[PDB]
Design a protein around this ligand. Structure first.
Ligand SMILES: c1cc(CN2CCCNCCNCCCNCC2)ccc1CN1CCCNCCNCCCNCC1
Ligand SMILES: CC(C)CCC[C@@H](C)[C@H]1CC[C@H]2[C@@H]3CC=C4C[C@@H](O)CC[C@]4(C)[C@H]3CC[C@]12C
Lengths: 286, 50, 335, 221
């Protein structure tokens, strides 16, 4: 029933678009109107906010496509896919880099001031934006608009199923396993050193760290699972009827709509929770 | 405390003037040099170094 | 026995001061046209300091200035083009004052180290070197000014002032009489007298050549943090920690005008005048600077551009611009 | 106009030098020493004209120590210059309870020490600045307390005349004066004869303070 899709997905897309644009605009406005020097964690905030801004601005086209199928041309779909891929990969890579920086700052408190600066100023650029641009070549090559029945739809069109399987595996590998392992390892090492502490300031940070981990996986773990099962269907190793395929499709759509919430949750978690950012915003407002 | 008494005696034997005369002198000085004051009267950007 | 004589002398002084009080300033200044609301906009924003800024001083050419910070830096800027001309690293990073020689050849600095350092700028080799070091004060230095290339007058935290000799490095004259710590100092335009405002809520007028105090002015409730002469050299203005400013006249030997407001409760860190002496710039602890009216005692403008307490304030010789420096590590020029 | 280009190049060079100097200076640790009538500058100076700066290096860390016991001016007029130091080291003489000031015999010496500690701790400038407490002269205190009961200083003391109990009571009384329990911490250590634990204790306290500051800087809390 297309009623569910038409009445359910565009509304969520619009709400996510509004919340994300508001949050990222506020974060950019606060960061830009900063008179003092830029710390090692404000650059990460700027990178994350930019990536979320691109991911937010690529939403209205998907919302329209949900309402009325694609009629915007061929080049525009390629541009939308490229922007979507760039933002999606850059966001998680920036999150992993932030986790590594926090691990360096906490565990190696006194003898880690040069490694963090070098890591940011060079490795952020290289390892966040070069792998993100190199992964948009399939978007340039295959993302084309095609007419099916009386409708026009645009998405990646592979020659056969082998390319679909290998590219889905690459998507899973680059989107979940690597940033997931980095974030989990760094934050689990950080937590273990703050659990036995007695000070007040070492109990709030813990209460803020164990949240972040969840906010990653609870946003991303189900969605890839939906893909992980789906690829197994394409490999002819899972054998049930068309009902299983239909419910897998519905699960993937719903959970992707859920996972699109990172672009608006990240400003809440990585920026608005800290007291330093709130004080800076209060000075910037006045 | 002889030094304090001597200082008070030294600083007490002076001739003062009326407050009105000093106020009038200050007002006259302020009025006379009011023309040459870039802060009181804005200066056009042609002659503004900043 | 001496107490009775001192009380009688003080009573006679008060009676003489009250006798000469014919009419107040506000009574006879009511006919002049009030100045319009002053709106100054920042032109330059000098940056490069990494800590609080505690002093500044314009040059006599109205283009170069010097600023002292707690990061152990004394920077000579170029206000016109924002370029930094010099950046001298200090031996001690706890500095509270700075000065710029009238000839432009030397600079001075001092602070908690109890030593006034004179650095030479116009050197043949092009490298700034410590010209001289002056020691002998038993309290922290709070202000130091240049009479000429060979004489410097300092005020210390041991309730004393001193007139030195840079060539020999020895104290020439010592001014004593203050009870609390001396926090400010201002030289007369003719370099024949000066004033000192201390923590005993009183100001004193000293003669450089004679070496003896001439007049004493009182009327404040807390420590005096700043002082500045009127452009004609016949009056001065003081600011204290009880959120008020006062104007004293040497000839009348009594207070003339007071500047205060009910919305202000924090003290003044610095005061300055204008070229014609019509405006009384003052710096407050509430991150703001205020432009008063020296004749009508009415506020006429608020300069708000700093995120921290304003610590130093200055006006060029020709009055083209006003520079303010705060604990925000940023100087700002207003025109 | 080669003069303008030369001026711009010189400005850029000195700006780069200033940035390098600031980056180098931000890696150092700064400690401020406070004391009592004894000035609290006996053990720490030896274990390693107004303000005295002492530099040393322990475990690849540069420590600077500022002693201001020669500044007999108004403390209110220069105490804001030290806002931002890593920590304040405060010395208390344990074997000093049953003594009176030479200037004023009425006032107790340890009472004056507690008053000054309370004044320093609750200052508006030192809100997030931690305090490391060193209780000097423990052997003399142990030898003296047996002959002289600990009642001339604490009339409300009720316990056995034992060194451990009295030391714990004194430490508790000194730590009870803190009011900002949620923004600053107080570290207590009984100074020992060997010069291998005092600097180690200071190193550990500074490391903990640095970790707590990085928690705020990173935005975790
Ligand atoms: C991915 C996979 C699947 C599973 N199958 C198809 C995979 C082919 N291989 C057949 C194997 N199974 C056939 C039958 C069972 N699975 C159902 C379909 C379903 C949906 C998606 C998500 N894309 C991502 C495209 C990029 N745009 C992102 C935003 N777009 C928002 C629009 C709604 N989201 C659809 C868009
Ligand atoms: C379309 C895609 C490729 C655009 C990529 C733009 C990225 C690479 C750009 C956009 C804005 C840039 C930031 C703008 C300002 C600063 C402040 C500086 O002190 C450090 C670098 C930093 C944080 C930049 C890093 C690079 C940055 C994040």
């Amino acid at each position: 029933n297309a009623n569910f899709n038409k009445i359910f997905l565009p509304t969520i897309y619009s709400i996510i678009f509004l919340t994300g644009i508001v949050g990222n605009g506020l974060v950019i406005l606060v960061m830009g109107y900063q008179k003092k020097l830029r710390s090692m964690t404000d650059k990460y905030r700027l990178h994350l906010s930019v990536a979320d801004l691109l991911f937010v601005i690529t939403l209205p086209f998907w919302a329209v496509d949900a309402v009325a199928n694609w009629y915007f041309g061929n080049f525009l779909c390629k541009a939308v896919h490229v922007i979507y891929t760039v933002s999606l990969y850059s966001s998680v890579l920036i999150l992993a880099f932030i986790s590594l920086d926090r691990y360096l700052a906490i565990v190696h408190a006194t003898n880690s001031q040069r490694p963090r600066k070098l890591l940011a100023e060079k490795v952020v650029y290289v390892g966040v934006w070069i792998p993100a641009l190199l992964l948009t070549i399939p978007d340039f090559i295959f993302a084309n608009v095609s007419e099916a029945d009386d409708r026009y739809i645009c998405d990646r069109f592979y020659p056969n199923d082998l390319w679909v399987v290998v590219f889905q595996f690459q998507h899973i590998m680059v989107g979940l396993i690597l940033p997931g392992i980095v974030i989990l390892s760094c934050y689990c090492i950080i937590i273990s050193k703050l659990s036995h502490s007695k000070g007040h300031q070492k109990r709030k940070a813990l209460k803020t760290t164990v949240i972040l981990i969840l906010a990653f996986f609870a946003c991303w773990l189900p969605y890839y699972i939906g893909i992980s099962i789906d690829s197994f269907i394409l490999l002819e190793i899972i054998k049930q009827g068309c009902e299983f395929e239909n419910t897998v499709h519905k699960w993937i759509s719903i959970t992707e709509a859920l996972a699109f919430f990172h672009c608006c949750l990240n400003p809440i978690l990585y920026a608005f929770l800290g007291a330093k950012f709130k004080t800076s915003a209060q000075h910037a407002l006045t | 405390a002889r030094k304090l008494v001597e200082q008070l005696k030294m600083e007490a034997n002076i001739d003062r003037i009326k407050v009105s005369k000093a106020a009038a002198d200050l007002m006259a000085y302020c009025e006379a040099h009011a023309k040459e004051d870039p802060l009181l009267t804005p200066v056009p950007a042609s002659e503004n170094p900043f | 026995q001496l107490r009775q004589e001192a009380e009688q002398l003080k009573n006679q002084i008060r009676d003489a001061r009250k006798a000469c009080a014919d009419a107040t300033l506000s009574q006879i200044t009511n006919n002049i046209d009030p100045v319009g609301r002053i709106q100054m906009r920042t032109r330059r924003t000098l940056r490069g300091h990494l800590a609080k800024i505690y002093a500044m001083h314009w040059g006599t050419d109205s283009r170069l200035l010097v600023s002292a910070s707690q990061d152990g830096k004394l920077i000579i800027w170029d206000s016109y083009t924002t370029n930094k001309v010099h950046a001298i690293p200090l031996r001690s990073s706890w500095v509270m004052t700075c000065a710029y020689a009238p000839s432009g050849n030397y600079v001075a600095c001092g602070g908690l180290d109890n030593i006034c350092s004179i650095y030479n700028l116009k050197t043949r080799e092009g490298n700034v070197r410590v010209s001289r070091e002056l020691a002998g004060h038993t309290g922290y230095l709070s202000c130091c000014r240049f009479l000429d290339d060979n004489q410097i007058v300092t005020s210390s935290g041991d309730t004393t002032c001193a007139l030195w000799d840079i060539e020999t490095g020895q104290q020439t004259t010592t001014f004593t009489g203050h009870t609390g710590d001396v926090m400010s100092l201002s030289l007369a335009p003719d370099t024949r007298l000066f004033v000192s405002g201390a923590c005993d809520a009183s100001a004193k007028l000293w003669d450089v050549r004679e070496g003896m105090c001439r007049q004493t002015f009182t009327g404040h409730e807390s420590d005096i943090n700043a002082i500045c002469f009127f452009p004609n050299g016949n009056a001065f203005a003081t600011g204290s920690d009880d959120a008020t400013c006062r104007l004293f006249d040497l000839r009348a030997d009594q207070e003339l005008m007071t500047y205060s407001h009910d919305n202000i409760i924090c003290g003044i860190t610095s005061v300055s005048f204008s070229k014609s002496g019509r405006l009384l710039l003052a710096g407050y602890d509430d991150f703001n600077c205020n432009v008063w009216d020296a004749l009508k005692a009415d506020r006429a403008g608020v300069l708000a551009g700093h995120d921290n307490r304003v610590s130093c304030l200055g006006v060029t010789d020709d009055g083209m611009a006003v520079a303010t420096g705060s604990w925000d590590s940023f100087l700002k020029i207003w025109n | 106009s080669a003069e303008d280009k030369a001026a711009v190049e010189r400005s850029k060079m000195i700006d780069r030098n200033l940035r390098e100097d600031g980056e180098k200076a931000a890696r150092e640790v700064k400690l401020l020493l406070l004391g009592a009538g004894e000035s609290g500058k006996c053990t720490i100076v030896k274990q390693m004209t107004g303000i005295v700066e002492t530099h040393f290096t322990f475990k690849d860390l540069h420590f600077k120590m500022f002693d201001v016991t020669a500044q007999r001016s108004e403390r209110k007029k220069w105490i804001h210059c030290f806002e931002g130091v890593t920590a304040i080291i405060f010395c208390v003489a344990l074997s000093d309870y049953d003594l009176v000031l030479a200037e004023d015999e009425e006032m107790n010496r340890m009472h004056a020490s507690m008053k000054l500690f309370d004044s320093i701790c609750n200052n508006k400038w030192f809100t997030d600045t931690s305090i490391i407490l060193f209780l000097n002269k423990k052997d003399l205190f142990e030898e003296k307390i047996k002959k002289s009961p600990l009642t001339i200083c604490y009339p409300e003391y009720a316990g056995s005349n034992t060194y451990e109990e009295a030391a714990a009571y004194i430490q508790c009384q000194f730590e009870d004066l803190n009011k900002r329990k949620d923004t600053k911490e107080i570290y207590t250590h009984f100074t020992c004869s060997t010069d291998t634990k005092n600097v180690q204790f200071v190193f550990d306290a500074v490391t903990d303070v640095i970790i707590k500051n990085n928690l705020k800087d990173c935005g975790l809390f």
